[PDB]
């Protein structure tokens, strides 16, 4: 019997064709991200080094989380206390993170999602001091810019987009990542109520007035007529002053689909199927599905392809999501590309057999896609082979294993509680304290759903869940959801 394990991270990098040894990682975050990151990487560590702590971890702990005794602290190998209060004083403080990363020192940082995870200055400052980042590089995020730039880049690449103030704007497109000229970028914004109403009548009401610098429930507004347009436009300005503003046609109740992207530092990028997150309650992804079956496999594959083209073009690295808008008929529209890993990523892990944070870490050490066991197995190749893999036209096109249903849940010392179920054995969850997620697997969608329902029911027993998880059951059992109808209007009269 051959030995597949290696001595140290050093031998691994060498034998797997990487070009950088990371063995000390700093987690710029807390909660379920801090924990999930560590659980996944340590799982991979024990499989590759027979040592769960082969890759060390340092976490930041604010006075709050420290007193509340978050599970992630005792889980970490080392922890550094940071100022409490709003995240700009700690988790979201780029200058602090880069500072701690250097002093220890660590060979890399992981931010996951939330806080400073989407701030290009973080990977920039980290790179400037020789500290790797488990995510896309600053050049790649910059090259993508906000929704304005990215949409121009989307249209440059011929991917559909919803009617917007920038419709039709494209950039002239061997190396070198795409860029959007400051003069082409301005042609997509509106400097006043004048050109605002201009674009408004060209896009048609209802529409959305959004600040690029917007987000977090700010800088956005729904205008349904030209009469209210002015006040609503000025309201967006007063909220996020200085911010470039653009208009976009309001999506007429359709399905929201995401494609899971994964790319190394060699121009190679693959799709790991997608997720279906149409069911939402007040801008909240309530129920999610893996993979997305509502849309024809043929149409979804194309969406994967456009997502990979978009990724390769901005020189993306690591993991990221491309959100699309699939309509009842058969049309889809690019919405955005999340330059980070998401909270509901386990869905993909479960149907593709890919340990994503482990993937990120290996990619950050410079290991190429075809040298990641998980990806090789997904492609029907040898676990530890070395032969190249033709991703464009594979000899064994990957197939997702089963189906996954995920539900966001709410309550009635510790910041993250691990949920287990004696009822269903194919379901696991957690609860941050507020909210949490439950991930149910099944041989097919049908079984995936049944499991979730039993698990949720097993949840209703707990006092903190004798109510909050009742509508999720009712929802999951409604014939409409069962048959997986295209229309999602039934949620309202539930």
GROMACS .gro file of C-alpha atoms in nm:
model
  494
    1UNK     CA    1   0.000   0.000   0.000
    2UNK     CA    2   0.145   0.335  -0.111
    3UNK     CA    3   0.177   0.640   0.116
    4UNK     CA    4  -0.008   0.948  -0.015
    5UNK     CA    5   0.065   1.166   0.290
    6UNK     CA    6   0.359   1.404   0.314
    7UNK     CA    7   0.588   1.529   0.592
    8UNK     CA    8   0.520   1.899   0.600
    9UNK     CA    9   0.336   2.173   0.407
   10UNK     CA   10   0.679   2.228   0.254
   11UNK     CA   11   0.696   1.881   0.097
   12UNK     CA   12   0.335   1.916  -0.016
   13UNK     CA   13   0.401   2.241  -0.202
   14UNK     CA   14   0.705   2.084  -0.368
   15UNK     CA   15   0.540   1.759  -0.471
   16UNK     CA   16   0.216   1.922  -0.588
   17UNK     CA   17   0.376   2.183  -0.809
   18UNK     CA   18   0.297   2.481  -0.589
   19UNK     CA   19   0.536   2.773  -0.543
   20UNK     CA   20   0.483   2.900  -0.190
   21UNK     CA   21   0.464   2.750   0.156
   22UNK     CA   22   0.173   2.861   0.375
   23UNK     CA   23   0.165   2.692   0.715
   24UNK     CA   24   0.050   2.978   0.932
   25UNK     CA   25  -0.281   3.141   0.846
   26UNK     CA   26  -0.455   3.439   1.001
   27UNK     CA   27  -0.837   3.438   1.006
   28UNK     CA   28  -0.964   3.797   0.966
   29UNK     CA   29  -1.308   3.709   1.098
   30UNK     CA   30  -1.507   3.527   1.364
   31UNK     CA   31  -1.832   3.336   1.402
   32UNK     CA   32  -1.933   3.058   1.164
   33UNK     CA   33  -1.680   3.181   0.908
   34UNK     CA   34  -1.393   3.152   1.154
   35UNK     CA   35  -1.511   2.801   1.253
   36UNK     CA   36  -1.601   2.667   0.908
   37UNK     CA   37  -1.270   2.786   0.773
   38UNK     CA   38  -1.086   2.593   1.045
   39UNK     CA   39  -1.297   2.281   1.031
   40UNK     CA   40  -1.252   2.242   0.653
   41UNK     CA   41  -0.877   2.313   0.642
   42UNK     CA   42  -0.800   2.091   0.942
   43UNK     CA   43  -1.002   1.811   0.784
   44UNK     CA   44  -0.780   1.847   0.478
   45UNK     CA   45  -0.475   1.875   0.703
   46UNK     CA   46  -0.541   1.538   0.865
   47UNK     CA   47  -0.586   1.373   0.527
   48UNK     CA   48  -0.260   1.509   0.395
   49UNK     CA   49  -0.036   1.523   0.703
   50UNK     CA   50  -0.213   1.285   0.942
   51UNK     CA   51  -0.188   1.598   1.153
   52UNK     CA   52  -0.489   1.821   1.207
   53UNK     CA   53  -0.276   2.119   1.313
   54UNK     CA   54  -0.029   2.104   1.023
   55UNK     CA   55  -0.164   2.441   0.915
   56UNK     CA   56  -0.166   2.677   1.210
   57UNK     CA   57  -0.433   2.938   1.269
   58UNK     CA   58  -0.436   3.274   1.445
   59UNK     CA   59  -0.769   3.444   1.508
   60UNK     CA   60  -0.866   3.795   1.614
   61UNK     CA   61  -1.076   3.820   1.928
   62UNK     CA   62  -1.269   4.128   2.034
   63UNK     CA   63  -1.369   4.183   2.399
   64UNK     CA   64  -1.725   4.085   2.305
   65UNK     CA   65  -1.648   3.745   2.150
   66UNK     CA   66  -1.384   3.688   2.415
   67UNK     CA   67  -1.620   3.728   2.710
   68UNK     CA   68  -1.892   3.533   2.528
   69UNK     CA   69  -1.630   3.262   2.478
   70UNK     CA   70  -1.669   3.198   2.108
   71UNK     CA   71  -1.593   2.843   1.999
   72UNK     CA   72  -1.347   2.969   1.736
   73UNK     CA   73  -1.103   3.100   2.001
   74UNK     CA   74  -1.036   2.772   2.182
   75UNK     CA   75  -1.036   2.620   1.837
   76UNK     CA   76  -0.757   2.843   1.704
   77UNK     CA   77  -0.387   2.769   1.754
   78UNK     CA   78  -0.325   3.128   1.860
   79UNK     CA   79  -0.549   3.433   1.905
   80UNK     CA   80  -0.483   3.806   1.921
   81UNK     CA   81  -0.716   4.041   2.113
   82UNK     CA   82  -0.842   4.341   1.915
   83UNK     CA   83  -1.057   4.651   1.989
   84UNK     CA   84  -1.426   4.583   2.037
   85UNK     CA   85  -1.717   4.773   1.885
   86UNK     CA   86  -1.809   4.806   1.516
   87UNK     CA   87  -1.593   4.601   1.276
   88UNK     CA   88  -1.401   4.904   1.143
   89UNK     CA   89  -1.219   4.881   1.476
   90UNK     CA   90  -1.139   4.511   1.428
   91UNK     CA   91  -1.252   4.242   1.180
   92UNK     CA   92  -1.311   4.496   0.904
   93UNK     CA   93  -0.995   4.698   0.972
   94UNK     CA   94  -0.758   4.632   0.681
   95UNK     CA   95  -0.466   4.819   0.836
   96UNK     CA   96  -0.502   4.611   1.153
   97UNK     CA   97  -0.527   4.277   0.971
   98UNK     CA   98  -0.220   4.349   0.756
   99UNK     CA   99  -0.044   4.464   1.073
  100UNK     CA  100  -0.114   4.146   1.270
  101UNK     CA  101  -0.038   3.933   0.963
  102UNK     CA  102   0.315   4.080   0.963
  103UNK     CA  103   0.400   4.075   1.334
  104UNK     CA  104   0.330   3.704   1.397
  105UNK     CA  105   0.401   3.647   1.110
  106UNK     CA  106   0.162   3.437   0.900
  107UNK     CA  107   0.200   3.337   0.534
  108UNK     CA  108  -0.160   3.415   0.451
  109UNK     CA  109  -0.496   3.558   0.547
  110UNK     CA  110  -0.851   3.428   0.499
  111UNK     CA  111  -1.148   3.662   0.536
  112UNK     CA  112  -1.424   3.450   0.389
  113UNK     CA  113  -1.737   3.663   0.372
  114UNK     CA  114  -1.857   3.978   0.543
  115UNK     CA  115  -1.637   4.254   0.689
  116UNK     CA  116  -1.327   4.338   0.484
  117UNK     CA  117  -1.364   4.032   0.257
  118UNK     CA  118  -1.468   4.235  -0.048
  119UNK     CA  119  -1.223   4.521   0.003
  120UNK     CA  120  -0.949   4.515  -0.266
  121UNK     CA  121  -0.719   4.714  -0.038
  122UNK     CA  122  -0.687   4.407   0.186
  123UNK     CA  123  -0.536   4.173  -0.072
  124UNK     CA  124  -0.335   4.475  -0.196
  125UNK     CA  125  -0.176   4.558   0.140
  126UNK     CA  126  -0.125   4.190   0.213
  127UNK     CA  127   0.058   4.136  -0.119
  128UNK     CA  128   0.263   4.452  -0.064
  129UNK     CA  129   0.409   4.290   0.250
  130UNK     CA  130   0.449   3.940   0.110
  131UNK     CA  131   0.138   3.795   0.274
  132UNK     CA  132  -0.079   3.569   0.055
  133UNK     CA  133  -0.457   3.602   0.041
  134UNK     CA  134  -0.710   3.317   0.022
  135UNK     CA  135  -0.918   3.491  -0.240
  136UNK     CA  136  -0.886   3.696  -0.563
  137UNK     CA  137  -0.591   3.942  -0.593
  138UNK     CA  138  -0.642   4.321  -0.575
  139UNK     CA  139  -0.569   4.354  -0.948
  140UNK     CA  140  -0.856   4.112  -1.019
  141UNK     CA  141  -1.110   4.287  -0.795
  142UNK     CA  142  -1.007   4.630  -0.921
  143UNK     CA  143  -1.038   4.498  -1.278
  144UNK     CA  144  -1.395   4.404  -1.192
  145UNK     CA  145  -1.497   4.723  -1.012
  146UNK     CA  146  -1.855   4.779  -0.897
  147UNK     CA  147  -2.174   4.669  -1.070
  148UNK     CA  148  -2.126   4.946  -1.325
  149UNK     CA  149  -1.780   4.842  -1.444
  150UNK     CA  150  -1.851   4.471  -1.414
  151UNK     CA  151  -2.172   4.503  -1.624
  152UNK     CA  152  -1.980   4.688  -1.896
  153UNK     CA  153  -1.727   4.404  -1.882
  154UNK     CA  154  -2.017   4.157  -1.893
  155UNK     CA  155  -2.159   4.315  -2.211
  156UNK     CA  156  -1.809   4.347  -2.354
  157UNK     CA  157  -1.801   3.967  -2.320
  158UNK     CA  158  -2.149   3.937  -2.473
  159UNK     CA  159  -2.326   3.808  -2.163
  160UNK     CA  160  -2.683   3.942  -2.134
  161UNK     CA  161  -2.769   4.211  -1.876
  162UNK     CA  162  -3.088   4.386  -1.765
  163UNK     CA  163  -3.173   4.720  -1.930
  164UNK     CA  164  -2.972   4.983  -1.746
  165UNK     CA  165  -2.823   5.331  -1.761
  166UNK     CA  166  -2.517   5.164  -1.911
  167UNK     CA  167  -2.677   4.927  -2.163
  168UNK     CA  168  -2.468   4.897  -2.478
  169UNK     CA  169  -2.148   5.035  -2.328
  170UNK     CA  170  -1.858   4.802  -2.416
  171UNK     CA  171  -1.477   4.812  -2.402
  172UNK     CA  172  -1.235   4.706  -2.677
  173UNK     CA  173  -1.136   4.350  -2.591
  174UNK     CA  174  -0.243   3.670  -2.436
  175UNK     CA  175  -0.233   3.814  -2.086
  176UNK     CA  176  -0.347   4.145  -1.937
  177UNK     CA  177  -0.682   4.160  -1.760
  178UNK     CA  178  -0.968   4.368  -1.898
  179UNK     CA  179  -1.008   4.730  -1.796
  180UNK     CA  180  -1.288   4.983  -1.826
  181UNK     CA  181  -1.181   5.339  -1.922
  182UNK     CA  182  -1.295   5.611  -1.683
  183UNK     CA  183  -1.470   5.773  -1.977
  184UNK     CA  184  -1.666   5.464  -2.067
  185UNK     CA  185  -1.754   5.414  -1.699
  186UNK     CA  186  -1.913   5.759  -1.670
  187UNK     CA  187  -2.140   5.689  -1.969
  188UNK     CA  188  -2.323   5.445  -1.742
  189UNK     CA  189  -2.400   5.686  -1.460
  190UNK     CA  190  -2.643   5.976  -1.421
  191UNK     CA  191  -2.517   6.305  -1.278
  192UNK     CA  192  -2.858   6.462  -1.223
  193UNK     CA  193  -3.233   6.431  -1.232
  194UNK     CA  194  -3.207   6.546  -1.594
  195UNK     CA  195  -3.012   6.258  -1.744
  196UNK     CA  196  -3.169   6.040  -1.480
  197UNK     CA  197  -3.520   6.085  -1.619
  198UNK     CA  198  -3.354   6.054  -1.960
  199UNK     CA  199  -3.236   5.699  -1.896
  200UNK     CA  200  -3.551   5.638  -1.694
  201UNK     CA  201  -3.785   5.663  -1.994
  202UNK     CA  202  -3.543   5.455  -2.201
  203UNK     CA  203  -3.543   5.172  -1.942
  204UNK     CA  204  -3.908   5.208  -1.844
  205UNK     CA  205  -4.065   5.199  -1.499
  206UNK     CA  206  -4.054   5.038  -1.260
  207UNK     CA  207  -3.675   5.061  -1.211
  208UNK     CA  208  -3.409   5.088  -0.943
  209UNK     CA  209  -3.194   5.388  -0.853
  210UNK     CA  210  -2.873   5.252  -0.701
  211UNK     CA  211  -2.545   5.403  -0.583
  212UNK     CA  212  -2.238   5.200  -0.689
  213UNK     CA  213  -2.089   5.273  -0.347
  214UNK     CA  214  -2.423   5.148  -0.213
  215UNK     CA  215  -2.514   4.836  -0.020
  216UNK     CA  216  -2.625   4.729   0.326
  217UNK     CA  217  -2.976   4.857   0.263
  218UNK     CA  218  -2.847   5.197   0.155
  219UNK     CA  219  -2.816   5.401  -0.162
  220UNK     CA  220  -3.098   5.206  -0.323
  221UNK     CA  221  -3.449   5.311  -0.421
  222UNK     CA  222  -3.738   5.180  -0.625
  223UNK     CA  223  -3.899   5.443  -0.849
  224UNK     CA  224  -4.224   5.354  -1.023
  225UNK     CA  225  -4.291   5.675  -1.213
  226UNK     CA  226  -4.126   5.988  -1.346
  227UNK     CA  227  -4.315   6.197  -1.089
  228UNK     CA  228  -4.136   6.045  -0.791
  229UNK     CA  229  -3.808   5.985  -0.973
  230UNK     CA  230  -3.652   6.321  -0.871
  231UNK     CA  231  -3.709   6.304  -0.494
  232UNK     CA  232  -3.605   5.937  -0.489
  233UNK     CA  233  -3.295   6.014  -0.689
  234UNK     CA  234  -3.196   6.297  -0.454
  235UNK     CA  235  -3.260   6.064  -0.162
  236UNK     CA  236  -2.998   5.824  -0.296
  237UNK     CA  237  -2.752   6.109  -0.317
  238UNK     CA  238  -2.816   6.233   0.036
  239UNK     CA  239  -2.761   5.879   0.166
  240UNK     CA  240  -2.435   5.782  -0.012
  241UNK     CA  241  -2.297   6.126  -0.119
  242UNK     CA  242  -2.036   6.137  -0.394
  243UNK     CA  243  -2.122   5.785  -0.506
  244UNK     CA  244  -2.170   5.722  -0.881
  245UNK     CA  245  -2.537   5.645  -0.945
  246UNK     CA  246  -2.693   5.418  -1.207
  247UNK     CA  247  -3.037   5.294  -1.307
  248UNK     CA  248  -3.148   4.938  -1.370
  249UNK     CA  249  -3.475   4.779  -1.482
  250UNK     CA  250  -3.656   4.611  -1.194
  251UNK     CA  251  -3.645   4.233  -1.245
  252UNK     CA  252  -3.999   4.107  -1.292
  253UNK     CA  253  -4.013   3.822  -1.041
  254UNK     CA  254  -3.783   3.556  -1.186
  255UNK     CA  255  -3.545   3.293  -1.056
  256UNK     CA  256  -3.208   3.381  -0.906
  257UNK     CA  257  -2.930   3.145  -1.003
  258UNK     CA  258  -2.566   3.135  -0.906
  259UNK     CA  259  -2.271   2.954  -1.063
  260UNK     CA  260  -1.987   2.847  -0.837
  261UNK     CA  261  -1.653   2.952  -0.981
  262UNK     CA  262  -1.311   2.813  -0.881
  263UNK     CA  263  -0.983   2.933  -1.037
  264UNK     CA  264  -0.610   2.885  -0.976
  265UNK     CA  265  -0.325   3.128  -1.052
  266UNK     CA  266  -0.262   2.992  -1.403
  267UNK     CA  267  -0.560   3.105  -1.606
  268UNK     CA  268  -0.757   2.789  -1.525
  269UNK     CA  269  -1.113   2.827  -1.399
  270UNK     CA  270  -1.391   2.570  -1.355
  271UNK     CA  271  -1.757   2.572  -1.259
  272UNK     CA  272  -1.874   2.355  -0.970
  273UNK     CA  273  -2.238   2.352  -1.070
  274UNK     CA  274  -2.454   2.625  -0.918
  275UNK     CA  275  -2.713   2.710  -0.655
  276UNK     CA  276  -3.077   2.810  -0.675
  277UNK     CA  277  -3.165   3.092  -0.436
  278UNK     CA  278  -3.500   3.220  -0.557
  279UNK     CA  279  -3.691   3.172  -0.232
  280UNK     CA  280  -3.624   3.491  -0.031
  281UNK     CA  281  -3.792   3.680   0.256
  282UNK     CA  282  -3.729   4.055   0.256
  283UNK     CA  283  -3.391   4.051   0.082
  284UNK     CA  284  -3.289   3.731   0.265
  285UNK     CA  285  -3.195   3.399   0.104
  286UNK     CA  286  -3.429   3.171   0.296
  287UNK     CA  287  -3.419   2.844   0.106
  288UNK     CA  288  -3.142   2.743  -0.132
  289UNK     CA  289  -3.089   2.447  -0.366
  290UNK     CA  290  -2.791   2.260  -0.509
  291UNK     CA  291  -2.765   2.213  -0.795
  292UNK     CA  292  -3.007   2.440  -0.984
  293UNK     CA  293  -3.244   2.215  -1.177
  294UNK     CA  294  -3.523   2.466  -1.251
  295UNK     CA  295  -3.334   2.571  -1.563
  296UNK     CA  296  -3.247   2.343  -1.856
  297UNK     CA  297  -2.908   2.180  -1.804
  298UNK     CA  298  -2.813   2.309  -2.148
  299UNK     CA  299  -2.897   2.670  -2.060
  300UNK     CA  300  -2.728   2.650  -1.722
  301UNK     CA  301  -2.405   2.509  -1.868
  302UNK     CA  302  -2.391   2.816  -2.093
  303UNK     CA  303  -2.431   3.036  -1.785
  304UNK     CA  304  -2.136   2.847  -1.638
  305UNK     CA  305  -1.937   2.919  -1.954
  306UNK     CA  306  -2.013   3.293  -1.948
  307UNK     CA  307  -1.921   3.288  -1.579
  308UNK     CA  308  -1.586   3.124  -1.655
  309UNK     CA  309  -1.524   3.372  -1.941
  310UNK     CA  310  -1.601   3.658  -1.707
  311UNK     CA  311  -1.367   3.511  -1.444
  312UNK     CA  312  -1.078   3.436  -1.678
  313UNK     CA  313  -1.108   3.786  -1.818
  314UNK     CA  314  -1.057   3.978  -1.490
  315UNK     CA  315  -0.784   3.731  -1.400
  316UNK     CA  316  -0.981   3.585  -1.111
  317UNK     CA  317  -0.817   3.354  -0.860
  318UNK     CA  318  -0.963   3.134  -0.583
  319UNK     CA  319  -1.339   3.091  -0.540
  320UNK     CA  320  -1.617   3.324  -0.646
  321UNK     CA  321  -1.982   3.338  -0.748
  322UNK     CA  322  -2.152   3.473  -1.062
  323UNK     CA  323  -2.517   3.561  -0.997
  324UNK     CA  324  -2.760   3.531  -1.286
  325UNK     CA  325  -3.128   3.601  -1.335
  326UNK     CA  326  -3.311   3.319  -1.513
  327UNK     CA  327  -3.656   3.399  -1.647
  328UNK     CA  328  -3.955   3.170  -1.690
  329UNK     CA  329  -3.921   3.174  -2.069
  330UNK     CA  330  -3.553   3.093  -2.119
  331UNK     CA  331  -3.358   3.418  -2.091
  332UNK     CA  332  -3.096   3.492  -1.830
  333UNK     CA  333  -2.910   3.803  -1.717
  334UNK     CA  334  -2.577   3.866  -1.550
  335UNK     CA  335  -2.620   4.039  -1.216
  336UNK     CA  336  -2.281   4.035  -1.044
  337UNK     CA  337  -1.972   3.841  -0.951
  338UNK     CA  338  -1.907   3.796  -0.579
  339UNK     CA  339  -1.529   3.809  -0.538
  340UNK     CA  340  -1.558   3.589  -0.231
  341UNK     CA  341  -1.672   3.259  -0.087
  342UNK     CA  342  -2.030   3.262   0.043
  343UNK     CA  343  -2.192   3.129   0.357
  344UNK     CA  344  -2.407   2.879   0.169
  345UNK     CA  345  -2.108   2.731  -0.004
  346UNK     CA  346  -2.142   2.391   0.166
  347UNK     CA  347  -2.420   2.320  -0.085
  348UNK     CA  348  -2.161   2.294  -0.359
  349UNK     CA  349  -1.915   2.106  -0.139
  350UNK     CA  350  -2.181   1.844  -0.078
  351UNK     CA  351  -2.267   1.782  -0.441
  352UNK     CA  352  -1.921   1.814  -0.590
  353UNK     CA  353  -1.696   1.668  -0.322
  354UNK     CA  354  -1.481   1.974  -0.302
  355UNK     CA  355  -1.345   2.108   0.028
  356UNK     CA  356  -1.352   2.473  -0.082
  357UNK     CA  357  -1.145   2.637   0.189
  358UNK     CA  358  -0.893   2.357   0.144
  359UNK     CA  359  -0.912   2.434  -0.229
  360UNK     CA  360  -0.849   2.804  -0.161
  361UNK     CA  361  -0.547   2.732   0.061
  362UNK     CA  362  -0.384   2.499  -0.194
  363UNK     CA  363  -0.445   2.752  -0.473
  364UNK     CA  364  -0.283   3.022  -0.254
  365UNK     CA  365   0.027   2.802  -0.223
  366UNK     CA  366   0.028   2.794  -0.602
  367UNK     CA  367  -0.104   2.444  -0.664
  368UNK     CA  368  -0.268   2.423  -1.011
  369UNK     CA  369  -0.627   2.306  -1.051
  370UNK     CA  370  -0.544   1.967  -1.206
  371UNK     CA  371  -0.328   1.886  -0.899
  372UNK     CA  372  -0.609   1.921  -0.644
  373UNK     CA  373  -0.728   1.566  -0.567
  374UNK     CA  374  -1.093   1.676  -0.518
  375UNK     CA  375  -1.107   1.836  -0.864
  376UNK     CA  376  -0.932   1.536  -1.024
  377UNK     CA  377  -1.180   1.293  -0.870
  378UNK     CA  378  -1.465   1.522  -0.982
  379UNK     CA  379  -1.327   1.486  -1.336
  380UNK     CA  380  -1.301   1.108  -1.317
  381UNK     CA  381  -0.921   1.113  -1.299
  382UNK     CA  382  -0.673   0.959  -1.054
  383UNK     CA  383  -0.666   1.098  -0.694
  384UNK     CA  384  -0.292   1.177  -0.706
  385UNK     CA  385  -0.217   1.174  -1.078
  386UNK     CA  386  -0.027   1.451  -1.253
  387UNK     CA  387  -0.156   1.434  -1.609
  388UNK     CA  388  -0.310   1.763  -1.733
  389UNK     CA  389  -0.689   1.786  -1.754
  390UNK     CA  390  -0.881   1.937  -2.043
  391UNK     CA  391  -1.145   2.141  -1.859
  392UNK     CA  392  -1.297   2.285  -2.178
  393UNK     CA  393  -1.376   1.941  -2.324
  394UNK     CA  394  -1.327   1.680  -2.043
  395UNK     CA  395  -1.316   1.306  -2.105
  396UNK     CA  396  -1.558   1.250  -1.812
  397UNK     CA  397  -1.786   1.559  -1.774
  398UNK     CA  398  -1.853   1.587  -1.398
  399UNK     CA  399  -2.194   1.505  -1.253
  400UNK     CA  400  -2.323   1.638  -0.922
  401UNK     CA  401  -2.372   1.372  -0.657
  402UNK     CA  402  -2.733   1.387  -0.541
  403UNK     CA  403  -2.920   1.696  -0.431
  404UNK     CA  404  -2.895   1.950  -0.148
  405UNK     CA  405  -3.149   2.172   0.026
  406UNK     CA  406  -3.037   2.451   0.255
  407UNK     CA  407  -3.253   2.662   0.483
  408UNK     CA  408  -3.169   2.976   0.679
  409UNK     CA  409  -3.311   2.953   1.032
  410UNK     CA  410  -3.394   3.193   1.315
  411UNK     CA  411  -3.414   3.174   1.697
  412UNK     CA  412  -3.723   3.245   1.906
  413UNK     CA  413  -2.184   3.164   2.620
  414UNK     CA  414  -2.077   3.111   2.259
  415UNK     CA  415  -2.122   3.270   1.917
  416UNK     CA  416  -2.165   2.956   1.704
  417UNK     CA  417  -2.354   2.641   1.806
  418UNK     CA  418  -2.311   2.316   1.615
  419UNK     CA  419  -2.649   2.165   1.528
  420UNK     CA  420  -2.687   1.787   1.501
  421UNK     CA  421  -2.996   1.579   1.430
  422UNK     CA  422  -3.074   1.229   1.559
  423UNK     CA  423  -3.365   1.226   1.314
  424UNK     CA  424  -3.201   1.278   0.976
  425UNK     CA  425  -2.841   1.161   0.940
  426UNK     CA  426  -2.786   1.353   0.615
  427UNK     CA  427  -2.842   1.694   0.767
  428UNK     CA  428  -2.616   1.924   0.966
  429UNK     CA  429  -2.639   2.286   1.073
  430UNK     CA  430  -2.533   2.552   1.318
  431UNK     CA  431  -2.659   2.869   1.481
  432UNK     CA  432  -2.474   3.198   1.527
  433UNK     CA  433  -2.559   3.411   1.830
  434UNK     CA  434  -2.989   3.530   1.571
  435UNK     CA  435  -2.956   3.315   1.255
  436UNK     CA  436  -2.811   2.994   1.113
  437UNK     CA  437  -2.823   2.738   0.832
  438UNK     CA  438  -2.923   2.377   0.782
  439UNK     CA  439  -2.779   2.173   0.501
  440UNK     CA  440  -2.969   1.864   0.389
  441UNK     CA  441  -2.839   1.607   0.139
  442UNK     CA  442  -3.038   1.346  -0.050
  443UNK     CA  443  -3.002   1.091  -0.332
  444UNK     CA  444  -3.244   1.312  -0.528
  445UNK     CA  445  -3.424   1.643  -0.468
  446UNK     CA  446  -3.721   1.452  -0.320
  447UNK     CA  447  -3.512   1.285  -0.051
  448UNK     CA  448  -3.314   1.603   0.006
  449UNK     CA  449  -3.639   1.783   0.091
  450UNK     CA  450  -3.787   1.506   0.311
  451UNK     CA  451  -3.467   1.498   0.518
  452UNK     CA  452  -3.470   1.874   0.570
  453UNK     CA  453  -3.834   1.862   0.685
  454UNK     CA  454  -3.762   1.591   0.944
  455UNK     CA  455  -3.454   1.780   1.060
  456UNK     CA  456  -3.652   2.105   1.089
  457UNK     CA  457  -3.919   1.920   1.278
  458UNK     CA  458  -3.651   1.781   1.503
  459UNK     CA  459  -3.560   2.148   1.548
  460UNK     CA  460  -3.911   2.262   1.646
  461UNK     CA  461  -3.875   2.058   1.965
  462UNK     CA  462  -3.598   2.290   2.092
  463UNK     CA  463  -3.774   2.578   2.266
  464UNK     CA  464  -3.588   2.839   2.063
  465UNK     CA  465  -3.739   2.683   1.748
  466UNK     CA  466  -4.098   2.593   1.839
  467UNK     CA  467  -4.215   2.861   1.595
  468UNK     CA  468  -3.953   3.013   1.367
  469UNK     CA  469  -3.906   2.690   1.166
  470UNK     CA  470  -4.276   2.630   1.114
  471UNK     CA  471  -4.317   2.828   0.795
  472UNK     CA  472  -4.008   2.659   0.646
  473UNK     CA  473  -4.185   2.323   0.681
  474UNK     CA  474  -4.511   2.458   0.537
  475UNK     CA  475  -4.312   2.606   0.254
  476UNK     CA  476  -4.114   2.293   0.181
  477UNK     CA  477  -4.433   2.086   0.179
  478UNK     CA  478  -4.647   2.314  -0.038
  479UNK     CA  479  -4.720   2.126  -0.361
  480UNK     CA  480  -4.581   2.423  -0.552
  481UNK     CA  481  -4.230   2.377  -0.407
  482UNK     CA  482  -4.263   1.999  -0.434
  483UNK     CA  483  -4.314   2.002  -0.810
  484UNK     CA  484  -4.046   2.274  -0.825
  485UNK     CA  485  -4.266   2.505  -1.031
  486UNK     CA  486  -4.101   2.789  -1.224
  487UNK     CA  487  -4.319   3.065  -1.070
  488UNK     CA  488  -4.227   3.182  -0.720
  489UNK     CA  489  -4.535   3.394  -0.659
  490UNK     CA  490  -4.694   3.149  -0.414
  491UNK     CA  491  -4.460   3.261  -0.136
  492UNK     CA  492  -4.661   3.574  -0.080
  493UNK     CA  493  -4.994   3.405   0.001
  494UNK     CA  494  -4.835   3.140   0.223
   0.00000   0.00000   0.00000
